[PDB]
């Protein structure tokens, strides 16, 4: 386990207060659209299993499927973006704190670099 045990981690918290400094996902996000598509597919499968007209029966429950999937997907995307931002922040902090472990290397141009040539014949 990598992230668990991080200092300042409040248990059983889906979104801490520091996650509110990040841009919230746009409502037109392709991931949100895919979540809504999954909800619509679940509604169609529900109609098919229960032996109802697939594309015309249960419009209210299909709408509820889509809405629930979009809601949960939005919150899941917020948490995912927060976790990735936290990972990048920790990585950059450690790189700053350990310059001898992450040193800069000399940049030699290809004119100076010697590389072997392997003919194709």
């Amino acid at each position: 386990t990598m992230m668990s045990g991080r200092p300042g981690r409040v248990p059983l918290q889906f979104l801490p207060n520091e996650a509110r400094s990040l841009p919230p996902p746009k409502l037109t996000d392709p991931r949100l659209v895919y979540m809504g598509f999954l909800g619509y597919c679940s509604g169609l499968i529900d109609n098919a299993i229960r032996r109802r007209p697939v594309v015309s029966a249960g419009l209210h429950r299909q709408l509820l499927y889509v809405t629930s999937f979009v809601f949960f997907g939005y919150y899941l995307l917020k948490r995912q973006d927060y976790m990735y931002a936290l990972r990048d922040h920790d990585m950059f902090a450690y790189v700053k704190s350990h310059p001898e472990d992450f040193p800069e290397k000399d940049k030699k141009t290809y004119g100076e670099i010697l590389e072997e040539f392997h003919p194709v014949r």
């Binding site: 668990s4 045990g5 409040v10 248990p11 059983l12």
Partner: protein
């Protein structure tokens, strides 16, 4: 795996019984209370790897 409901809600379900240097009835000390206290105070807050090392 480990949903820390005790830490989240401020409960003491088993943390009283976790160690033998905690609050004992009638203030009865453990056999190795001093050694355990020193080990805990050394290893607290530095992580498992650093605590072992």
């Amino acid at each position: 795996p480990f949903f820390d409901v005790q830490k989240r809600l401020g409960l003491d379900l088993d943390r009283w019984m976790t160690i033998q240097s905690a609050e004992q009835p009638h203030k009865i000390p453990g056999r190795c209370h001093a050694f355990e206290k020193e080990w805990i105070e050394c290893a607290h807050g530095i992580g498992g790897i650093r605590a072992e090392k």
